[PDB]
Amino acid sequence: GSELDQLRQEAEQLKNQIRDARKACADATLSQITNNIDPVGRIQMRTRRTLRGHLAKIYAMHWGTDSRLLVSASQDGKLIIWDSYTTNKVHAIPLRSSWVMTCAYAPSGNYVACGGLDNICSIYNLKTREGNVRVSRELAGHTGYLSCCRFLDDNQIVTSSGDTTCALWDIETGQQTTTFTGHTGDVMSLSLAPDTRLFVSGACDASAKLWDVREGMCRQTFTGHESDINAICFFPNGNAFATGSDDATCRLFDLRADQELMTYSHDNIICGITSVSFSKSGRLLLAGYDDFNCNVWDALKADRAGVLAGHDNRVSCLGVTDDGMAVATGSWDSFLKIWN
Amino acid sequence: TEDQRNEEKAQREANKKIEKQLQKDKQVYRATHRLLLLGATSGIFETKFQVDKVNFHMFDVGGQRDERRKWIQCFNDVTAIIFVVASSNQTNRLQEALNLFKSIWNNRWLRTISVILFLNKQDLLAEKVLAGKSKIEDYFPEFARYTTPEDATPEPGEDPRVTRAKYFIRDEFLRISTASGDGRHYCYPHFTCAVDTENIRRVFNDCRDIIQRMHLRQYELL
Amino acid sequence: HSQGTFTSDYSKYLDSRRAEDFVKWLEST
Amino acid sequence: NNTASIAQARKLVEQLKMEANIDRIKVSKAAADLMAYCEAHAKEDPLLTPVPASENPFR
Amino acid sequence: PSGQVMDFLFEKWKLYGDQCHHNLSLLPPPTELVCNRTFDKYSCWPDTPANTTANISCPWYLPWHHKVQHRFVFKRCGQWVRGPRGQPWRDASQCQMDGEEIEVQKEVAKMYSSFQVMYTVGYSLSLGALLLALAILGGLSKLHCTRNAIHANLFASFVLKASSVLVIDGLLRTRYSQKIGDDLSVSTWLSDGAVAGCRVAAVFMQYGIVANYCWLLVEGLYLHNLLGLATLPERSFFSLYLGIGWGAPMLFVVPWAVVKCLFENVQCWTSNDNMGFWWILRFPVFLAILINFFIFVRIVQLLVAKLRARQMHHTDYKFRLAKSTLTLIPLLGVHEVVFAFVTDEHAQGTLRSAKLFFDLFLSSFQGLLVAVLYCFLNKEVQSELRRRWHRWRLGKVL
Amino acid sequence: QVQLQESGGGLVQPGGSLRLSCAASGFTFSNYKMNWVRQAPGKGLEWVSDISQSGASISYTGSVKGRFTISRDNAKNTLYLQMNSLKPEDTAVYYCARCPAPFTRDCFDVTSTTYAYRGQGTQVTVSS
């Protein structure tokens, strides 16, 4: 194609404008600043509660903002809202489609979303008039499997699907408001910033972008990984995030420095990381691998603090409460282990 | 107080409302075969049917895209993957069915699943053997040095030149199947026929053959 | 079963030998 | 060489021109902010320092 | 009767005792007759002076009186003589039983002593290997299935078998190893109170034997239900199989005890005087083992049909078919059928001693074999043991 | 950034030989299962040849068996494809791809115009 092979090279000439100024703004590394503070040690967490209610493998899980209730979606076709203090169930919602890949609990506590291979985000109303759990809306705009969804409030919800797009919905009108195009591979997980004005999204092209909710533009793109991204989570101040992938490596990126800081890899670990999450202070980076165990990483020294291995099958999710009190882990056996 | 022990008691009584429902739904889930139709409600295309008081559950995944390395991990707890293959500017689609089969057969999460593959549209192929003046061994050059196996059932009407081209593709999937399958999961090759009351029975007789081999490996008799 | 009939044969044997030892006690004392 | 595909490359270079005009701060002043945050909230994190059972709600 | 020689001996010895006291009360008052009829514990002599060999018949209370009926016992007396300073003394060499029968009893003593140590080793190596297998199926959390539930009830059914036999063998090596004192040291032995600890252990054994054959049958009925059924079972009838295994023995042991307490009462309840009362425990054993054999046939003729296909890359079909059928015999307890139809009544000679060795060898090692073939060599169990062996060493040392 | 820059390929009469090579950059090259993909004009994307994580297992399309030979040099981080005795219907655009995970044997990569870990293309033209 004429007047195009220079355009393909004008992009690679402009990526060299990125990667030299991104290198010129690297005074040191995250290791040799940190190496004066002393580490935490062996963090021996124990299974407190074990939630035995599903039938098939569990893909997702999301805590509530009171840090007491938690949704878990499993691919038997049902969605169960637990109670983490006393192991008893408060709801059990029969889904229409059996292959559910995500779930969310609204920050007010009134709504629960889900979604999967039916390409539809389904909103459920927990505080209805007569007393039931019936479908409020069915957000049908995506042309691919829905992999993650998170509420901003009770009115709007941002989703990420396997059609390489993210979308900002509006549950009252049922239709999209802003779509977020720009990824090349299937977007697997998003994570909201704490101020809910920005979010990031890791996809299967080894690149996690950064989106702006009110405008709809991708501000900056983070490429440090080798293989497909399976998880994402903000550092709790809103200026960094960690990124799990299939090359058995977490990477703590930074927004203002605009590049990777640290690399959480150990050579005895070869299998991919299903999910990631920080603690309340951000010192610990927990990360569930494709192997049946969960590894705590000290997110500043990049040394493995502790290992939490209470699962008989690959963990499919990972969630730390808003008060930081416990850690819930789900897996492909029908079990939710709560750790602290 | 009495009041906090009053709704704590009503919270535990919500278990018996739904743990009785979970045991009600555990019965219908375990006696239902979940299959997977993939060939080589707008997105999952679920299909229920009933063969001799046995519930089946099909899933057609045509509503998705074609980078299937992520959503195929959902389908590990299925009993069998039904894998239809069209036998037919020659795009070489038949090798594409071999490489997709080789990736399912070697996937880490799909190392326990048998494949029921239907070699389809031999009526389109039995014309293209005679009407093709050259051969279609230009794509498979190891076809001239291949003979029909003796333990074969050549149905009449088709030439042995068509029978040789029909069983060569079947052995080409078993050369992938028997390379690394090591007894955990097998392959059940078939040929498509009149669909009503004869093609679903081949799925039914193979899904008994998978579960009867499944328990016999739990008892280590196979 | 075969455990019960072995136990029955052994108990009949022990009873006969205890009778013989009782007669041997009567002829010793 | 499709004309619908050359404008997709124009969508690529238009995004990268917007990613190159951004004010990046250096790592030594951006990695020091993260350890300053982990130090200030160190005692309010119930996973590093374990909690006695009268406060821990999960036992 | 049979199996109660000691009590019947003791009863008619008391009868002989007071009978000859009453018949010694008849005697007229005597001239001479210097030593004059002192009743020994053995028998009773009349008044005899100058009595170098005095002759009366052998006493009729002996268990072998039919063979010593035509002989005489001798004793001589002034006073009754004490030869080796044993204060009673007499010639009891005629009434004593022969040496050939006591030699045959010595040979069968060696036989029963050799059999009893043969399964004591067998029940010990099973009772140890099953409690280690119950700790694996209990602790290791991946292995909790419905299949390993009926394994663990079978493993706890050989433990009830092997412990209840080692108790009743200990309570017979306690009861028949004492000494013999006075009659009050024997009447305290032939009493229903001194055997009440032994009669409970007899019912505790006979329940444990039949609860084995009911749990062999259940795992015969569970694996047969799982084949031919097209799907997994819906309800998973574990309340039905646990009722056949532990409750159906009580349908036959309880009608045995209330017959063995009423009609046929001997020292311990381990002696079968009447065959018909012994058929109400072989009936849940013949009907269990026979059903297991029927299931065995139909599994193996299915297990060959899964080897007629996929045959070219197996290419031999001999070694594993001989492996898969020999690993099913212990689980279904099909070994018992070889000498089943030779019952207790018809086995008389060395076939009787051959039946009590082929069954008692294999039925004692059966608890060892099912813990090895189904717990210690199950490849999913060895997968989970190799996982928890690594997380202990990597978590502590590294 | 995962980048696959490739060279070689040009105008050649049928019977002649070429040599293609993509010097990979941005990942550990010794962990992935590299492979070549072909797109003839008017046709779909088509698989050509595999190579294992070290060089042991080698696969081919049947229509290129014996003519093409694939090679991997781990120390220089590049992937060779030695083509002998070209055909006039072998004129296409050749891509080198990689299988998306380390240490695996399965691959999902001969797909549509969207795929992440694929080179940009080298034109191979066989004519006279």
Side-chain angles (χ1 to χ4, degrees), chain C residues 16-26, chain E residues 180:
Chain C
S16 179
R17 295 292 292 166
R18 186 63 182 267
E20 292 184 355
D21 288 332
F22 181 75
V23 176
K24 184 171 86 272
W25 175 69
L26 287 174
Chain E
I180 298 169

PDB file of all heavy atoms in Angstrom, chain C residues 16-26, chain E residues 180:
ATOM      1  N   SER C  16     -13.848 -80.214  74.965  1.00  0.00           N
ATOM      2  CA  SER C  16     -13.494 -81.614  75.174  1.00  0.00           C
ATOM      3  C   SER C  16     -12.185 -81.757  75.944  1.00  0.00           C
ATOM      4  O   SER C  16     -12.071 -82.619  76.825  1.00  0.00           O
ATOM      5  CB  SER C  16     -13.405 -82.335  73.833  1.00  0.00           C
ATOM      6  OG  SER C  16     -13.047 -83.690  74.019  1.00  0.00           O
ATOM      7  N   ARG C  17     -11.194 -80.906  75.654  1.00  0.00           N
ATOM      8  CA  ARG C  17      -9.942 -80.974  76.404  1.00  0.00           C
ATOM      9  C   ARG C  17     -10.108 -80.507  77.839  1.00  0.00           C
ATOM     10  O   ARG C  17      -9.417 -81.012  78.728  1.00  0.00           O
ATOM     11  CB  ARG C  17      -8.851 -80.155  75.728  1.00  0.00           C
ATOM     12  CG  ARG C  17      -8.452 -80.688  74.391  1.00  0.00           C
ATOM     13  CD  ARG C  17      -7.747 -82.026  74.481  1.00  0.00           C
ATOM     14  NE  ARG C  17      -6.435 -81.930  75.112  1.00  0.00           N
ATOM     15  CZ  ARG C  17      -5.742 -82.976  75.551  1.00  0.00           C
ATOM     16  NH1 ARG C  17      -6.239 -84.199  75.430  1.00  0.00           N
ATOM     17  NH2 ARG C  17      -4.553 -82.802  76.110  1.00  0.00           N
ATOM     18  N   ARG C  18     -11.010 -79.557  78.091  1.00  0.00           N
ATOM     19  CA  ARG C  18     -11.257 -79.154  79.468  1.00  0.00           C
ATOM     20  C   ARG C  18     -11.961 -80.256  80.246  1.00  0.00           C
ATOM     21  O   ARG C  18     -11.675 -80.454  81.431  1.00  0.00           O
ATOM     22  CB  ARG C  18     -12.064 -77.860  79.500  1.00  0.00           C
ATOM     23  CG  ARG C  18     -12.254 -77.296  80.885  1.00  0.00           C
ATOM     24  CD  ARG C  18     -10.908 -76.927  81.471  1.00  0.00           C
ATOM     25  NE  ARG C  18     -11.012 -76.415  82.830  1.00  0.00           N
ATOM     26  CZ  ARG C  18     -11.112 -75.129  83.136  1.00  0.00           C
ATOM     27  NH1 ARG C  18     -11.107 -74.220  82.176  1.00  0.00           N
ATOM     28  NH2 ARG C  18     -11.203 -74.754  84.401  1.00  0.00           N
ATOM     29  N   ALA C  19     -12.838 -81.019  79.583  1.00  0.00           N
ATOM     30  CA  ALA C  19     -13.430 -82.191  80.226  1.00  0.00           C
ATOM     31  C   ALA C  19     -12.377 -83.253  80.536  1.00  0.00           C
ATOM     32  O   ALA C  19     -12.392 -83.859  81.618  1.00  0.00           O
ATOM     33  CB  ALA C  19     -14.527 -82.775  79.344  1.00  0.00           C
ATOM     34  N   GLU C  20     -11.447 -83.480  79.601  1.00  0.00           N
ATOM     35  CA  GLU C  20     -10.381 -84.451  79.840  1.00  0.00           C
ATOM     36  C   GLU C  20      -9.458 -84.002  80.966  1.00  0.00           C
ATOM     37  O   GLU C  20      -9.020 -84.824  81.777  1.00  0.00           O
ATOM     38  CB  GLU C  20      -9.572 -84.690  78.570  1.00  0.00           C
ATOM     39  CG  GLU C  20     -10.321 -85.411  77.471  1.00  0.00           C
ATOM     40  CD  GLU C  20      -9.438 -85.696  76.276  1.00  0.00           C
ATOM     41  OE1 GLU C  20      -8.274 -85.247  76.283  1.00  0.00           O
ATOM     42  OE2 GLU C  20      -9.901 -86.368  75.332  1.00  0.00           O
ATOM     43  N   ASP C  21      -9.173 -82.701  81.048  1.00  0.00           N
ATOM     44  CA  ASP C  21      -8.339 -82.204  82.136  1.00  0.00           C
ATOM     45  C   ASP C  21      -9.071 -82.237  83.469  1.00  0.00           C
ATOM     46  O   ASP C  21      -8.433 -82.384  84.513  1.00  0.00           O
ATOM     47  CB  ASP C  21      -7.848 -80.790  81.830  1.00  0.00           C
ATOM     48  CG  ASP C  21      -6.796 -80.764  80.740  1.00  0.00           C
ATOM     49  OD1 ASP C  21      -6.071 -81.770  80.588  1.00  0.00           O
ATOM     50  OD2 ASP C  21      -6.683 -79.736  80.040  1.00  0.00           O
ATOM     51  N   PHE C  22     -10.400 -82.126  83.458  1.00  0.00           N
ATOM     52  CA  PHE C  22     -11.151 -82.292  84.699  1.00  0.00           C
ATOM     53  C   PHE C  22     -11.109 -83.734  85.181  1.00  0.00           C
ATOM     54  O   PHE C  22     -10.997 -83.989  86.387  1.00  0.00           O
ATOM     55  CB  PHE C  22     -12.593 -81.835  84.506  1.00  0.00           C
ATOM     56  CG  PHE C  22     -13.431 -81.945  85.738  1.00  0.00           C
ATOM     57  CD1 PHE C  22     -13.284 -81.038  86.769  1.00  0.00           C
ATOM     58  CD2 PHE C  22     -14.371 -82.949  85.864  1.00  0.00           C
ATOM     59  CE1 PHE C  22     -14.057 -81.132  87.904  1.00  0.00           C
ATOM     60  CE2 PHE C  22     -15.145 -83.050  86.997  1.00  0.00           C
ATOM     61  CZ  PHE C  22     -14.987 -82.142  88.018  1.00  0.00           C
ATOM     62  N   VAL C  23     -11.182 -84.691  84.254  1.00  0.00           N
ATOM     63  CA  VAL C  23     -11.054 -86.095  84.646  1.00  0.00           C
ATOM     64  C   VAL C  23      -9.631 -86.391  85.123  1.00  0.00           C
ATOM     65  O   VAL C  23      -9.423 -87.153  86.079  1.00  0.00           O
ATOM     66  CB  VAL C  23     -11.483 -87.007  83.484  1.00  0.00           C
ATOM     67  CG1 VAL C  23     -11.261 -88.468  83.821  1.00  0.00           C
ATOM     68  CG2 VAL C  23     -12.944 -86.772  83.156  1.00  0.00           C
ATOM     69  N   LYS C  24      -8.637 -85.752  84.505  1.00  0.00           N
ATOM     70  CA  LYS C  24      -7.260 -85.894  84.969  1.00  0.00           C
ATOM     71  C   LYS C  24      -7.057 -85.251  86.339  1.00  0.00           C
ATOM     72  O   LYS C  24      -6.254 -85.745  87.140  1.00  0.00           O
ATOM     73  CB  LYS C  24      -6.309 -85.301  83.930  1.00  0.00           C
ATOM     74  CG  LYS C  24      -4.834 -85.456  84.233  1.00  0.00           C
ATOM     75  CD  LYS C  24      -3.975 -85.032  83.053  1.00  0.00           C
ATOM     76  CE  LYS C  24      -3.691 -83.540  83.058  1.00  0.00           C
ATOM     77  NZ  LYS C  24      -4.745 -82.760  82.356  1.00  0.00           N
ATOM     78  N   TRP C  25      -7.794 -84.177  86.641  1.00  0.00           N
ATOM     79  CA  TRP C  25      -7.777 -83.626  87.992  1.00  0.00           C
ATOM     80  C   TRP C  25      -8.403 -84.585  88.992  1.00  0.00           C
ATOM     81  O   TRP C  25      -7.909 -84.721  90.116  1.00  0.00           O
ATOM     82  CB  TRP C  25      -8.509 -82.287  88.055  1.00  0.00           C
ATOM     83  CG  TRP C  25      -8.574 -81.798  89.464  1.00  0.00           C
ATOM     84  CD1 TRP C  25      -7.535 -81.355  90.217  1.00  0.00           C
ATOM     85  CD2 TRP C  25      -9.720 -81.797  90.323  1.00  0.00           C
ATOM     86  NE1 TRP C  25      -7.964 -81.037  91.478  1.00  0.00           N
ATOM     87  CE2 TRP C  25      -9.303 -81.303  91.569  1.00  0.00           C
ATOM     88  CE3 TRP C  25     -11.061 -82.148  90.153  1.00  0.00           C
ATOM     89  CZ2 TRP C  25     -10.176 -81.150  92.640  1.00  0.00           C
ATOM     90  CZ3 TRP C  25     -11.928 -81.992  91.216  1.00  0.00           C
ATOM     91  CH2 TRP C  25     -11.483 -81.497  92.442  1.00  0.00           C
ATOM     92  N   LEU C  26      -9.505 -85.234  88.610  1.00  0.00           N
ATOM     93  CA  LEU C  26     -10.137 -86.198  89.507  1.00  0.00           C
ATOM     94  C   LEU C  26      -9.242 -87.404  89.755  1.00  0.00           C
ATOM     95  O   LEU C  26      -9.266 -87.982  90.846  1.00  0.00           O
ATOM     96  CB  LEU C  26     -11.483 -86.651  88.954  1.00  0.00           C
ATOM     97  CG  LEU C  26     -12.630 -85.656  89.021  1.00  0.00           C
ATOM     98  CD1 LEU C  26     -13.824 -86.211  88.295  1.00  0.00           C
ATOM     99  CD2 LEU C  26     -12.973 -85.409  90.463  1.00  0.00           C
TER     100      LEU C  26
ATOM    101  N   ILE E 180      -7.873 -75.811  87.577  1.00  0.00           N
ATOM    102  CA  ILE E 180      -9.078 -76.438  88.105  1.00  0.00           C
ATOM    103  C   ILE E 180      -8.888 -76.642  89.600  1.00  0.00           C
ATOM    104  O   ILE E 180      -7.983 -77.373  90.023  1.00  0.00           O
ATOM    105  CB  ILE E 180      -9.381 -77.767  87.400  1.00  0.00           C
ATOM    106  CG1 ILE E 180      -9.626 -77.529  85.914  1.00  0.00           C
ATOM    107  CG2 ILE E 180     -10.586 -78.431  88.023  1.00  0.00           C
ATOM    108  CD1 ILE E 180      -9.679 -78.790  85.104  1.00  0.00           C
TER     109      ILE E 180
END
